[PDB]
Amino acid sequence: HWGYGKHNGPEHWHKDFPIAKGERQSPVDIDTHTAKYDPSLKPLSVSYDQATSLRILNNGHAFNVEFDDSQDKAVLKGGPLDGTYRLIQFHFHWGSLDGQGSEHTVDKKKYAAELHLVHWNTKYGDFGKAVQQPDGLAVLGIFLKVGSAKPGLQKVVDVLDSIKTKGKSADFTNFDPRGLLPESLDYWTYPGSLTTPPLLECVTWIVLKEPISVSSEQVLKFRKLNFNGEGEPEELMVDNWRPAQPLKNRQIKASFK
Ligand SMILES: NS(=O)(=O)c1ccc(CNC(=O)COc2ccc3ccc(=O)oc3c2)cc1
């Protein structure tokens, strides 16, 4: 099955998922000089005050913090989006060293990690139906750089010891994702895909320009997780990122001048 190793990593995914070579794959490099300011874009509306987190899960490729999406509680709207998108989960991609880890890049710069807050379009009823539509998902991407600690991340970091291996989960209620946002909501946006199999081309990507800072100790704790299950040979969960894909016939639009 697919993963991030030499024998099953991103270069191999097209054999089981031919859409890997498709026309709107993610992530991409964001060339800041070529992205055009679009004055018709609106400010992003991030309404997380009623977010209800439930659980954190190691799925063998990252860890997901899962939310109650049975009602309009935490929603993303505005920006490039039409309609209402419900938060279902967030997760990260990160590197073995601080010089790599993000999926999107900015003028070829790689950040240490990248947070993805995943939302689905409520006009399609459920997540599984949404991923079958070109406007089914909105993913908010936030870069992480290593410097000062992010206080709002520490509750995530301190639970990772309890979900070290694939298939482990832990209760994770009352976590506030507003503590993971940077000050500015300036963003780039383009049409793309899921960055892991099945690589479906259903995502409006919204990537924030301002990164958040996390400490070296915080990201070192990410790198102690395992891709393997309990009792199996230890394979550290590092470098779980897909590299940039061809932009093809797409324009990246900037919300800011
Ligand atoms: N990194 S990202 O872009 O933010 C991102 C990436 C992915 C998701 C949601 N995940 C999925 O859709 C996977 O679904 C699957 C995969 C494999 C099988 C194998 C057998 C089978 O029968 O069912 C399957 C169903 C959300 C956000």
Ligand SMILES: [Zn+2]
């Ligand atoms: Zn992701």
